[PDB]
From Swiss-Prot, chain A:
Signal peptide: none annotated. The biotin cofactor is covalently attached to the central biotinyl-binding domain and is required for the catalytic activity. The lineage of its organism: Eukaryota, Metazoa, Chordata, Craniata, Vertebrata. It comes from the Eukaryota. This is Acetyl-CoA carboxylase 1. Cytosolic enzyme that catalyzes the carboxylation of acetyl-CoA to malonyl-CoA, the first and rate-limiting step of de novo fatty acid biosynthesis. This is a 2 steps reaction starting with the ATP-dependent carboxylation of the biotin carried by the biotin carboxyl carrier (BCC) domain followed by the transfer of the carboxyl group from carboxylated biotin to acetyl-CoA. The gene is ACACA. Monomer, homodimer, and homotetramer. Can form filamentous polymers. Interacts in its inactive phosphorylated form with the BRCT domains of BRCA1 which prevents ACACA dephosphorylation and inhibits lipid synthesis. Interacts with MID1IP1; interaction with MID1IP1 promotes oligomerization and increases its activity. It is linked to Acetyl-CoA carboxylase-alpha deficiency: An autosomal recessive inborn error of de novo fatty acid synthesis associated with severe brain damage, persistent myopathy and poor growth. Consists of an N-terminal biotin carboxylation/carboxylase (BC) domain that catalyzes the ATP-dependent transient carboxylation of the biotin covalently attached to the central biotinyl-binding/biotin carboxyl carrier (BCC) domain. The C-terminal carboxyl transferase (CT) domain catalyzes the transfer of the carboxyl group from carboxylated biotin to acetyl-CoA to produce malonyl-CoA. It comes from Homo sapiens.
UniProtKB/Swiss-Prot annotation, chain F:
It comes from Homo sapiens. It is found in: Cytoplasm, Cytosol. Expressed in brain, placenta, skeletal muscle, renal, pancreatic and adipose tissues; expressed at low level in pulmonary tissue; not detected in the liver. This is Acetyl-CoA carboxylase 1. Cytosolic enzyme that catalyzes the carboxylation of acetyl-CoA to malonyl-CoA, the first and rate-limiting step of de novo fatty acid biosynthesis. This is a 2 steps reaction starting with the ATP-dependent carboxylation of the biotin carried by the biotin carboxyl carrier (BCC) domain followed by the transfer of the carboxyl group from carboxylated biotin to acetyl-CoA. Monomer, homodimer, and homotetramer. Can form filamentous polymers. Interacts in its inactive phosphorylated form with the BRCT domains of BRCA1 which prevents ACACA dephosphorylation and inhibits lipid synthesis. Interacts with MID1IP1; interaction with MID1IP1 promotes oligomerization and increases its activity. The gene is ACACA. It comes from the Eukaryota.
């Protein structure tokens, strides 16, 4: 209960953590994906901040890096 | 004076043996009880102390029952509801030779003009007696047929509200088991009409809604919605529909599939209608009411009495000391007073025991001690009351002259005639 | 009980010779305490003594402190003196340091609202 | 609208109107394009579509939040269009499921941002398909799937459905603009269809009635010169703040977010040439038609408290359908039935249960109570109670009703209370009228408690054919519930003010 | 000066009661009501009028020609 | 009665002066009935009434 009380500050730190874990590296292993999946299933609205950003990662690491297109073209 | 209490013979730590059923029952059978159907004696208990229930106006408006009784030896007035069918006998007028006696049908769980008039009269009488009130509600609503709209049912429907709003004693509404309060009957006995005194409770096997299941089904579950439900439940419908929408088959096969779909849509209706009825009944539950905050608690029938004693007694005792506070400072409202009593209680008992407020037995004992004890612990509650009275008198004198300075010179002099010499020195020097 | 009475923060108002100071006190750990005074934050390493006193490290020097609550006074004894208030780096130690701080944040031991997020990002 | 990351293109359109009436229909539109090579489906093509659409949808929602909250134009129906350029081999049912999940997971935000419609173009195998989605409150998504048919003799393309639920777009060409009235000229028609006036038409009639009153009592009395219709009236709307207190606001009509409206009017009457203040209250028949919710009851209560404080009359214009009912819609969709025999449903059913997959995404909202059970080797959440996350459909409207009931009971005994019945009044809305005790009724209206349909169902035959058999003027005026009958609302208002002509300006 | 008024019928009236469609053996009836006489409904009306007029804050005028209350069955 | 009630800045309503006198006497009787029934506040009652009185009235209070 004591840990759940400060969940907003925990959410801020979690956003800062996710910013540096799956940022400028469009790739995800079979371990990060499970954590992100469980984290996106936090349907309680107080944790929405940590769910939403997590979904971004789940969709963000499937994009071209501009290196393939630039080199080939 | 207060209502007189007895050292009754019928206990408070017993349970209710007679249990309301879904089939018809005489509501008296749940107030006083009934003899054992299988023995020659052995009274099956009811809600109140045995032999204490006393009826009035029995043959009038038989769909409703009213009386007086005792709970733990605490006198109460009672209002209950007929679920059996009654037949109303009207005589002929000898002033008209073409007149005839008639027998009208009157279904239970339903208000009629006369039943509502009776309920209103009973409420007013019981209140002016100075009694608390118990109400066992199993009303589905008000009759809407031509006769009853002609015979003025809205009028007494509104008079019920007018009566309940003016009650000065506890009113406890309880929805028994296998009972349901629907809409028009909620809005006339809701606790929000007089929250200082009115309380509502519901069994686990009770129902409340703004409407029954069938009337809601008829509006929310139309044929098209039942069909959309068939679309994802019935394997036969699913097979035929997945096939009919499968492109590039043929014309005749599509025709056959469409006809089979129509046949199944007409066939399955009663079962999906009952499904809709149960999906309607699933949100007429009392847990939803507790969560929404429209009942104070969810009770078991059998133990009910032992609850309603200690609550009721507590309230009575509270109504005493609160009255004294209202006598001390008449300008204090009732929330202020409940909060004040909380404050006094935690101050004198301590914050560790602040949880002993929602414990009706212990708090009633404490209030009984503080009010009924004299030449003893000397009632710190009484000293607090005296202080509030003192402050009120002071504030009143000062508000009086602050609004009327012209009498100040006449006010001082008389107060210099009954004061000490040292107080006189303090008056002169300051 | 609801989860907003189990708080990790206390506002303490102490009046010294007419000057009222409103201080905030929370924790970053079971033994790491944070005090806001005059709008400035300070961390103190606090250990509980069996005799009711506290062993404090505030500015590098250690202190043994006691408190006595009166009807309208707070008598705070430090060493042999009393104050009465009226009642109205190597790249691998840094890793462990900041990791313990962040884990404490994850377990619910967080800085106060006006100072939080200014040190955690670092 | 300028925005960072200039691959999203956001627009705010103001509907074209003539040189008379101003613009009321404003709409945010989002247009984005999706660039990638064609997909070779090996059960691995969901990711591109889902991720790209969801990324663009999130960016669109963010920019929509910023633009909508930074301005004041009152948009109603925001729309989104995503064009999936590359080709994918995928059955339309799988596309339905994927877009359903992707949209439902943010339906709450899309509802908050007033996003009601969406259009998604996907090339199949390539034949373009169009997904037209209607996204109302975030529990159900009305998905309509169409293919483009180019088999024509001209350059014209057609929408053609898939047999199941043809919908409105069947035979719509390919490219049609939009515009609506969005308020104030569809609610007028919606009310006039039922035999009453739109609520914000109340004051004008009020003013007009007073003009006739300043004729009427001039044949009784040597009155002063009458005032101008501009000076004959002046009113201030009473709105609710975020706390539940009344704010004295001056704003344009149509801005009610609830089904109740309240005005404080000052006017000049032949009896008091300088000063006459009243409170008027009205139900909006167009907003979830009639029904009383908690905020409607709140506005009623605060308005009556104001009138009692100042000591001035209260008038209530009733056009309602009773208390609001409903059912947890999400649960109404995601529930399954455990038959006694799955192959013969007429042998009975044992219970209604949820699966864990859909249970785990609702239960944190306090919308339902279920019990775990193990049956047929399957783990199941048998439903026991359904609560609903939506506020204003449950027993809380009973608590509200009695509250305002008491207020009426009080208001009768402290100030003047008058009630007017225009279209209908059911349940509480009937009792409220009777608690005012000065009831005016309109012809072709009814005060009822139970419906003719329900009574006939319990009775088993067509006893009653109209509800005016139960609560009409042939019942309510001949029994003493209504004091006066009238043909319309203007006559009712003139009657109200005539009655006030006999009464003091205040209790003091 | 505004007043509320209560007066009394001396003519005969005929009270029309309809039939209830819920009962197929029901019939409409015409009852006779002589003036200068109280009936239950006439007295109820008089009471309601008194209360309403009083709570309006009006004076009251009463033109009484009542012979009494009906005593029939 | 119409003249005596509706006239202001005129004959000045001797009826109104009588009404003011009755109000004065009522307030006086009320204060005195209050403290006569509750002497325990008398010392608290006097002091506040020595804060908004003239110096000559203060002399009369001290001497009498
Ligand atoms: C006051 C009490 O405590 S009990 C009263 C509680 N409410 C009721 O009893 C409702 C009474 N029943 C009715 O709604 C009446 O039949 C009517 C006339 C008001 C509505 O019937 P209709 O003329 O068929 O209108 P309809 O039912 O279509 O209403 C429009 C929609 O709003 C919904 N709706 C209708 N009445 C209500 C209501 N009282 N509360 C909430 N929603 C409602 C319906 O689902 C309906 O759905 P649809 O448009 O998809 O068909």
């Amino acid at each position: 209960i004591f840990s759940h009380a400060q969940v907003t500050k925990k959410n801020l730190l979690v956003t800062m953590l996710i910013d540096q874990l799956c940022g400028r590296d469009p790739t995800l292993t079979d371990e990060l994906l499970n954590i992100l999946t469980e984290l996106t299933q936090l349907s309680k609205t107080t944790n929405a901040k940590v769910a939403l950003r997590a979904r971004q990662v789940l969709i963000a690491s499937h994009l071209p890096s501009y290196e393939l297109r630039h080199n080939q073209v | 004076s207060s209502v007189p209490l007895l050292n009754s013979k019928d206990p408070i730590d017993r349970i209710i043996e007679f249990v309301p059923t879904k089939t018809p029952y005489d509501p008296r059978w749940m107030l006083a009880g009934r003899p054992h159907p299988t023995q020659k004696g052995q009274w099956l208990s009811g809600f109140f102390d045995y032999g204490s229930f006393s009826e009035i106006m029995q043959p009038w408006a038989q769909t409703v029952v009213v009386g007086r009784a005792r709970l733990g030896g605490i006198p109460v007035g009672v209002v209950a509801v007929e679920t059996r069918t009654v037949e109303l006998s009207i005589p002929a007028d000898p002033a008209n030779l073409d007149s005839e006696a008639k027998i009208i049908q009157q279904a239970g769980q339903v208000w009629f003009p006369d039943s509502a008039f009776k309920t209103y009269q009973a409420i007013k009488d019981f209140n002016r007696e100075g009694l608390p009130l118990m109400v066992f509600a199993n009303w589905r609503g008000f009759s809407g047929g031509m006769k009853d709209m002609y015979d003025q049912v809205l009028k007494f429907g509104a008079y019920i509200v007018d009566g309940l709003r003016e009650c000065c004693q506890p009113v406890l509404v309880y929805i028994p088991p296998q009972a349901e309060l629907r809409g028009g009957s909620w809005v006339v006995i809701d606790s929000s009409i007089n929250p200082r005194h009115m309380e509502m409770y519901a069994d686990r096997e009770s129902r409340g809604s703004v409407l029954e299941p069938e009337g809601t089904v008829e509006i929310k579950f139309r044929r098209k919605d039942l069909v959309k439900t068939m679309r994802r439940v019935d394997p036969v419908y699913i097979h035929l529909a997945e096939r009919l929408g499968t492109p590039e088959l043929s014309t005749a096969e599509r025709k056959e599939l469409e006809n089979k779909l129509k046949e199944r849509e007409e066939f399955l209706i009663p079962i999906y209608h009952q499904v809709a009825v149960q999906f309607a009944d699933l949100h007429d539950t009392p847990g939803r009411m507790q969560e929404k905050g429209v009942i104070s608690d969810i009770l078991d029938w059998k133990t009910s009495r032992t609850f309603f004693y200690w609550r009721l007694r507590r309230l009575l005792l509270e109504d005493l000391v609160k009255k004294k506070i209202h006598n001390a400072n008449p300008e204090l409202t009732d929330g202020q007073i409940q909060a004040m009593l909380r404050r006094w209680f935690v101050e004198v008992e301590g914050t560790v025991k602040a949880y002993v407020w929602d414990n009706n037995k212990d708090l009633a004992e404490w209030l009984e001690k503080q009010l009924t004890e004299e030449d003893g612990v000397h009632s710190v509650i009484e000293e607090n009351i005296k202080c509030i009275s003192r402050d009120y008198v002071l504030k009143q004198i000062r508000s009086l002259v602050q609004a009327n300075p012209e009498v100040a010179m006449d006010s001082i002099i008389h107060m210099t005639q009954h004061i000490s010499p040292t107080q006189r020195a303090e008056v002169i020097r300051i | 009980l609801p989860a907003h009475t189990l708080l990790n923060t206390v506002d303490v108002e102490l009046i010294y010779e007419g000057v009222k100071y409103v201080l905030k006190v929370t924790r970053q750990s079971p033994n790491s305490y944070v005090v806001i005074m005059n709008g400035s934050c300070v961390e103190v390493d606090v250990h509980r003594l069996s005799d009711g006193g506290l062993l404090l490290s505030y500015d590098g020097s250690s202190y043994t402190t006691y408190m006595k609550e009166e009807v309208d006074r707070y008598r705070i004894t430090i060493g042999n003196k009393t104050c009465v208030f009226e009642k109205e780096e190597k790249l691998h130690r840094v890793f462990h340091y900041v990791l313990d701080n962040l884990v404490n944040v994850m377990n619910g031991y967080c800085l106060p609202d006006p100072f939080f997020s200014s040190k955690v990002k670092d | 609208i300028p925005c960072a990351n200039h691959k999203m293109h956001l627009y705010l359109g103001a509907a074209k109107v003539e040189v008379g009436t101003e613009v009321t229909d404003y709409r945010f539109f989002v247009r984005a394009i999706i660039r990638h090579s064609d997909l070779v489906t090996k059960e691995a093509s969901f990711e591109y579509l889902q991720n790209e659409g969801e990324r663009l949808l999130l960016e669109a929602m963010d920019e929509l939040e910023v633009a909508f909250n930074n301005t004041n134009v009152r948009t109603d129906c925001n729309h989104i269009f995503l064009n999936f350029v590359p080709t994918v081999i995928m059955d339309p049912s799988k596309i339905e499921e994927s877009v359903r999940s992707m949209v439902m997971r943010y339906g709450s935000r899309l509802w908050k941002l007033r996003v009601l419609q969406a259009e998604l173009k996907i090339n199949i195998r390539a034949i373009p398909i169009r997904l037209f989605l209607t996204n109302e409150s975030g529990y159900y998504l009305d998905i309509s799937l169409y293919k483009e048919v180019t088999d024509s003799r001209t350059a014209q393309i057609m929408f053609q459905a898939y047999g199941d639920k043809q919908g409105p777009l069947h035979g719509m060409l390919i490219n049609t603009p939009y515009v609506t009235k969005d308020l104030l000229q569809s609610k007028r028609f919606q009310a006039q269809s039922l035999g009453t006036t739109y609520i914000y038409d109340i004051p004008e009639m009020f003013r007009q009635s007073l003009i006739k009153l300043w004729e009427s009592m001039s044949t009784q009395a040597f009155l002063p010169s009458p005032p101008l219709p501009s000076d004959m009236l002046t009113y201030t709307e009473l709105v609710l703040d975020d706390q539940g207190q009344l704010v004295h606001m001056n704003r344009l009509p149509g801005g009610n977010e609830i089904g109740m409206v309240a005005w404080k009017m000052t006017f000049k009457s032949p009896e008091y040439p300088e000063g006459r203040d009243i409170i008027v209250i009205g139900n909006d028949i167009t907003y979830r038609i009639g029904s009383f919710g908690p905020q409607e009851d709140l506005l009623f209560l605060r308005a009556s408290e104001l009138a009692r404080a100042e000591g001035i009359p209260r008038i209530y214009v009733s056009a309602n359908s009773g208390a609001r009912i409903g059912l947890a819609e999400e649960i109404r969709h995601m529930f399954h039935v455990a038959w006694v025999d799955p192959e013969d449903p007429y042998k009975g059913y044992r219970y209604l249960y949820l699966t864990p997959q859909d249970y785990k995404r609702v239960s944190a909202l306090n919308s339902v109570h279920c019990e775990h059970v193990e049956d047929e080797g399957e783990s199941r959440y048998k439903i026991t109670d359904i609560i609903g996350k939506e506020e204003g459909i449950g027993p809380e409207n009973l608590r509200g009703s009695g509250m305002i009931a008491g207020e009426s009971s009080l208001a009768y005994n402290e100030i003047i209370t008058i009630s007017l019945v225009t279209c209908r009044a059911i349940g509480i809305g009937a009792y409220l009228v009777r608690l005012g005790q000065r009831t005016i009724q309109v012809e072709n209206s009814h005060l009822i408690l139970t419906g003719a349909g329900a009574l006939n169902k319990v009775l088993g035959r067509e006893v009653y054919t109209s509800n005016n058999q139960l609560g009409g003027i042939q019942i309510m005026h001949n029994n003493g519930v209504t004091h006066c009958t009238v043909c319309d609302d203007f006559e009712g208002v003139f009657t109200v003010l005539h009655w006030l002509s006999y009464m003091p300006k205040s209790v003091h």
